[PDB]
Amino acid sequence: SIKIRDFGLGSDLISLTNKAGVTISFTNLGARIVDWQKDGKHLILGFDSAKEYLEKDAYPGATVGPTAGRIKDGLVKISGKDYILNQNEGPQTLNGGEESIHTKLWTYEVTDLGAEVQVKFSLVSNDGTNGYPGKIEMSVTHSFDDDNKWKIHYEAISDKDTVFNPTGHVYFNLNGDASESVENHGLRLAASRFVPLKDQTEIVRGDIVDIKNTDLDFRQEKQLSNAFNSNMEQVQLVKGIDHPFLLDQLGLDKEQARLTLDDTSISVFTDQPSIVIFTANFGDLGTLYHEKKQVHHGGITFECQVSPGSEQIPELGDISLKAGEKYQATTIYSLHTKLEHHHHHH
Amino acid sequence: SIKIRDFGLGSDLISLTNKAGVTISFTNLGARIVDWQKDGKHLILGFDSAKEYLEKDAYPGATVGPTAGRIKDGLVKISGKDYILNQNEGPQTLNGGEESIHTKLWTYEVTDLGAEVQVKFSLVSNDGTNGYPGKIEMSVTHSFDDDNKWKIHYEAISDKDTVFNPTGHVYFNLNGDASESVENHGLRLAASRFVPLKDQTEIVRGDIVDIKNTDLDFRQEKQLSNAFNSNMEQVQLVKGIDHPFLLDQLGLDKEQARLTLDDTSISVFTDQPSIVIFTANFGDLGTLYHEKKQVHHGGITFECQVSPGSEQIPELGDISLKAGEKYQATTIYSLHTKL
Ligand SMILES: OC[C@H]1O[C@@H](O)[C@H](O)[C@@H](O)[C@@H]1O
Ligand SMILES: OC[C@H]1O[C@@H](O)[C@H](O)[C@@H](O)[C@@H]1O
Ligand code: NA
């Protein structure tokens, strides 16, 4: 079933319930996921109104772009030309600059296919917005089906050669309480290499490093605490994880990642080449989620996209988008029960 | 009473009914007025859903900006520097460029003061948006009161020196039907001068012309048919009226214009120096409003703002907005019924 109501400030909340009784909800404020519950338990982090997002933290569950991550000194080269984008994190352009797409009300239309329901959100980034050539007509379709798959499909077309590499900023927390660290979750990730950050400014270092057999190796499932407890320079630098992981095998067909807690798992599929993982390394900030003070490590993202730093490490890919060419990306989060045996204690 | 409902595409329709039973409704799509009615009759033009505005005509009742009107060659000088804005009508930048603020979903908050209810719409125009320096934080507050006063108050702040001169694009039609020309309405307007257009491109001609004692003198109430049947080359040029009129006496207290049809009249007040009047000179277009095919002259606007063309005729004013300065503007449309 589909339900809709005002969510505040003019945004709406679209709630869907599939045949298995699983519920998922979105808001057109930032074409974002607000909640996902199973048997009354939240699987992700989210707020109860639109104003909370705007006042506490506007990234959670959002669609972010046009370019996800940091761009050193806001400088991109588009078709032989240098373009400087909005710099909102020091000289860096983080998640498309200030007051980006995640802060706007997108128009939307809902399509009921029965076993699947689609919520297609649209927005136009005008030419020159935040320094990006355009205009860019974008659309994010979020869908949920009877098989517990939440899918994100991105599409875009630009009038001019530009850059495009958006992502979904959901944070999971299988504990269903922000005040509980995810160190107790099991993580499996099909990636043998990662991208180190230069320093606290978080721009990329310049090299690609192999992590096999290190505390960042999750090819074979392990508790997140292993990473959190690590004293590897990169973990210390960021106080947890906040890096891109390069997938070893590409393709929407492979389970790239799996996050488990007891009897629940979330599997990650995508057609993108990397997964940027950030573990809510907020220290004692304690942002309130549903009246619970969030803890350091109280959440984890799986932002599938082309890795950040390709400006410096060409090997990571190319995010340019040619005028008239159609951008498309697909990411999927599927929910499962009793997929494996995960019985631990922390 | 206040009622909020879905207007389509995720937009909302906010309807306010005052003590007199008069209803006015707005939508966050473009911080715009959708309807205004009394005793079941519409006073203004509007559609029945969001999609209509997007498909038929996105301007009606909307907040247009950041600059209202046409800018020659899309060119403006900011701090002695030339900037080229988005060109969406030939080489001109019309009403802020393509996909401007009138096609965006603004956030809003309703504030009920009893005798008055206010609806504050907000939107951030990112720096660089359509060539404009920013970011510009804008807000448009539409309010309605028990005295039948509909008021528009604009406010903006920019991080960088930029340009700013928005307007409300409501079209009135006291006939309450688009298929009926407003030629029967009577218009009074406190302006002795106007700004002629160069030609069919509608850019300014370059001069300011005295209208005293011409078909365009409305200093004394007159029927619109008069202007409409005029042979003045300017009327003939656009097939009606599509020009900036310079107000004689500036200030919010003075009734600047008055539109009348029978016992129903609309008074316009503003703190702006000019009023741009366009008489829906669409010819055979036939856009449909409420299932009624619009006729040529089936509407009229009162766009209060600084006259377009100041890039060429500096006497007109100056639309710049320096970093950190707070822009404010107020326009009021007041409804009266003779007894
Ligand atoms: O919370 C916003 C951001 O926090 C930063 O510290 C992370 O590096 C970003 O990747 C994330 O988008
Ligand atoms: O910009 C709003 C209106 O302005 C007039 O100058 C034009 O002639 C109209 O076609 C247009 O819809
Ligand atoms: Na809505």
Side-chain angles (χ1 to χ4, degrees):
Chain A
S1 69
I2 307 159
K3 247 79 176 87
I4 315 226
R5 66 158 168 98
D6 58 295
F7 192 55
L9 305 176
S11 70
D12 291 336
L13 178 71
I14 303 107
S15 308
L16 320 175
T17 299
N18 64 7
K19 118 172 335 104
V22 174
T23 69
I24 191 166
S25 64
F26 302 97
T27 180
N28 57 323
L29 173 73
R32 165 206 317 275
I33 184 171
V34 175
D35 194 17
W36 197 8
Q37 282 183 207
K38 193 203 173 249
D39 298 327
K41 193 188 282 167
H42 294 301
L43 301 183
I44 64 158
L45 299 182
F47 306 121
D48 303 291
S49 62
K51 199 174 120 295
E52 270 185 271
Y53 279 104
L54 293 185
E55 317 198 315
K56 310 169 159 176
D57 173 7
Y59 290 119
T63 285
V64 317
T67 55
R70 302 170 169 86
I71 293 185
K72 182 198 179 189
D73 296 323
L75 204 95
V76 298
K77 249 193 165 103
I78 301 173
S79 318
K81 251 211 171 102
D82 298 57
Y83 285 86
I84 305 170
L85 318 172
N86 187 262
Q87 304 177 289
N88 56 330
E89 190 197 63
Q92 271 62 258
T93 299
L94 165 75
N95 300 331
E98 70 186 344
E99 301 290 329
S100 201
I101 62 173
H102 66 293
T103 60
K104 320 282 192 203
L105 293 174
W106 294 46
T107 54
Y108 68 90
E109 282 190 287
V110 168
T111 295
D112 188 354
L113 310 184
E116 189 172 322
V117 169
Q118 297 171 2
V119 189
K120 188 183 178 193
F121 297 95
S122 300
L123 184 66
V124 167
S125 165
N126 303 60
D127 175 45
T129 296
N130 280 1
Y132 295 86
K135 71 169 191 281
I136 309 174
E137 317 184 21
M138 300 164 287
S139 92
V140 184
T141 299
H142 283 282
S143 59
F144 195 46
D145 72 16
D146 291 335
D147 297 294
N148 297 319
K149 295 169 255 135
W150 157 39
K151 168 185 13 162
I152 319 160
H153 183 55
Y154 299 83
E155 313 180 288
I157 302 304
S158 181
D159 272 4
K160 302 189 164 177
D161 289 354
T162 193
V163 295
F164 201 75
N165 182 43
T167 198
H169 210 294
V170 63
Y171 283 95
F172 289 92
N173 185 342
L174 312 194
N175 282 310
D177 176 338
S179 73
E180 280 178 275
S181 147
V182 298
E183 65 176 331
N184 70 342
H185 284 38
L187 169 69
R188 87 153 86 346
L189 173 74
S192 311
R193 292 163 300 159
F194 91 140
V195 188
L197 313 183
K198 194 158 259 159
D199 47 46
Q200 121 271 120
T201 68
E202 293 144 91
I203 54 147
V204 307
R205 194 165 63 191
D207 57 327
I208 296 152
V209 169
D210 191 80
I211 39 129
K212 309 217 242 96
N213 312 311
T214 71
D215 297 307
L216 295 184
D217 184 352
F218 284 92
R219 279 178 302 144
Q220 265 203 16
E221 191 197 270
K222 86 209 189 150
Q223 299 290 278
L224 276 159
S225 52
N226 294 290
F228 295 151
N229 297 340
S230 183
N231 62 9
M232 287 168 64
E233 166 242 326
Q234 287 281 316
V235 168
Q236 286 196 101
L237 178 78
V238 310
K239 295 174 213 269
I241 309 172
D242 197 351
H243 293 83
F245 287 75
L246 303 175
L247 303 174
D248 299 332
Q249 255 144 44
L250 294 225
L252 197 58
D253 52 304
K254 157 112 137 227
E255 182 186 28
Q256 306 283 10
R258 177 198 304 172
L259 174 93
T260 305
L261 179 67
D262 297 319
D263 294 312
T264 308
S265 284
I266 296 307
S267 306
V268 189
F269 301 84
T270 180
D271 61 6
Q272 301 297 300
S274 85
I275 294 179
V276 168
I277 290 157
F278 172 54
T279 49
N281 308 322
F282 301 120
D284 72 346
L285 186 48
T287 296
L288 288 184
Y289 280 86
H290 312 309
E291 309 298 346
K292 302 292 184 268
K293 214 135 306 93
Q294 186 187 213
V295 293
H296 184 59
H297 303 150
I300 178 174
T301 68
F302 295 101
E303 301 170 66
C304 303
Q305 52 171 103
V306 168
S307 173
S310 65
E311 287 75 30
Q312 292 64 238
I313 308 180
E315 309 59 38
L316 294 181
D318 170 55
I319 57 159
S320 60
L321 174 63
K322 303 240 74 71
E325 135 185 282
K326 211 233 254 131
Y327 175 89
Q328 285 199 102
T330 300
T331 292
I332 299 166
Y333 296 94
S334 71
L335 155 76
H336 293 285
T337 272
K338 316 206 46 166
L339 205 55
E340 63 180 53
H341 317 290
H342 184 263
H343 310 303
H344 303 283
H345 72 82
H346 285 254
Chain B
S1 92
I2 294 159
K3 272 283 170 335
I4 289 148
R5 73 182 200 44
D6 164 20
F7 197 54
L9 300 174
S11 68
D12 285 347
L13 181 68
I14 303 100
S15 308
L16 322 182
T17 293
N18 69 4
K19 253 127 256 192
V22 179
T23 298
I24 198 170
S25 68
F26 316 90
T27 177
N28 59 326
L29 171 73
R32 131 189 7 241
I33 186 171
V34 172
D35 200 14
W36 199 3
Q37 66 171 259
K38 185 159 95 315
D39 299 325
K41 166 128 111 197
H42 302 302
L43 307 166
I44 70 152
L45 301 183
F47 298 123
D48 312 280
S49 67
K51 208 146 201 188
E52 280 183 81
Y53 278 100
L54 293 184
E55 276 159 22
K56 301 173 186 189
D57 181 7
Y59 289 131
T63 286
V64 299
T67 47
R70 296 175 173 82
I71 297 167
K72 192 184 172 276
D73 293 318
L75 210 174
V76 302
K77 268 131 210 159
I78 293 161
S79 301
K81 189 210 173 177
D82 284 332
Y83 284 81
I84 310 143
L85 309 169
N86 183 264
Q87 302 161 278
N88 61 323
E89 193 192 50
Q92 268 56 261
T93 287
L94 164 80
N95 298 327
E98 67 183 348
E99 299 298 311
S100 213
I101 68 181
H102 58 292
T103 57
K104 309 294 178 182
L105 283 177
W106 283 60
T107 47
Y108 75 95
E109 289 190 285
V110 167
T111 297
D112 183 347
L113 296 171
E116 184 181 318
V117 178
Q118 293 166 355
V119 194
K120 187 191 212 146
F121 296 97
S122 305
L123 185 72
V124 166
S125 177
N126 291 83
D127 173 37
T129 299
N130 269 5
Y132 300 82
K135 88 186 166 270
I136 310 177
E137 297 190 3
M138 311 162 294
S139 79
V140 178
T141 297
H142 282 287
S143 70
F144 193 48
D145 73 5
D146 289 322
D147 285 306
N148 294 328
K149 298 193 218 100
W150 157 43
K151 181 213 314 172
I152 324 173
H153 185 54
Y154 306 79
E155 312 207 303
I157 299 246
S158 175
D159 278 1
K160 293 189 194 188
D161 292 348
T162 192
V163 286
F164 200 71
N165 183 29
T167 200
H169 207 301
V170 64
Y171 281 95
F172 284 99
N173 187 332
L174 305 184
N175 284 305
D177 176 339
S179 83
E180 291 181 48
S181 173
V182 314
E183 69 183 64
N184 55 341
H185 303 36
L187 166 80
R188 203 200 88 238
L189 168 69
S192 302
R193 289 126 92 216
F194 87 149
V195 179
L197 312 187
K198 190 217 234 193
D199 57 23
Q200 36 354 87
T201 66
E202 301 169 87
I203 53 168
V204 307
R205 182 162 81 193
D207 53 317
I208 299 169
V209 172
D210 184 288
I211 55 74
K212 298 170 152 135
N213 302 289
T214 84
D215 295 331
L216 296 184
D217 185 346
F218 281 98
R219 287 166 321 138
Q220 263 166 204
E221 186 174 334
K222 81 203 214 214
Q223 212 112 299
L224 281 164
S225 36
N226 294 144
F228 291 153
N229 294 304
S230 165
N231 55 38
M232 281 168 112
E233 81 118 327
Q234 287 287 305
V235 171
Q236 290 186 92
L237 177 75
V238 307
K239 303 178 255 162
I241 305 156
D242 198 355
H243 293 79
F245 283 80
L246 315 181
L247 301 178
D248 288 348
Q249 294 139 57
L250 302 204
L252 211 56
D253 48 346
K254 209 221 162 315
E255 162 198 48
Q256 311 275 10
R258 183 204 269 139
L259 187 74
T260 296
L261 184 68
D262 310 334
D263 23 50
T264 300
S265 92
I266 311 302
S267 314
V268 174
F269 295 78
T270 180
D271 59 354
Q272 296 300 292
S274 121
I275 298 188
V276 176
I277 299 188
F278 167 65
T279 50
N281 310 325
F282 306 113
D284 262 14
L285 213 206
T287 296
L288 289 167
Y289 291 75
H290 312 305
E291 295 318 310
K292 309 245 199 156
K293 186 153 11 279
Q294 187 177 218
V295 309
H296 180 73
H297 297 167
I300 178 172
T301 65
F302 294 102
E303 297 166 67
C304 295
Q305 62 177 87
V306 166
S307 182
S310 68
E311 295 77 22
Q312 288 65 247
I313 318 181
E315 308 104 77
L316 292 185
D318 171 23
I319 63 164
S320 91
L321 180 71
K322 303 285 171 7
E325 296 243 280
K326 178 150 168 223
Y327 171 105
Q328 292 199 227
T330 301
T331 294
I332 299 160
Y333 294 98
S334 157
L335 161 80
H336 322 251
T337 293
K338 106 171 332 257
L339 255 41

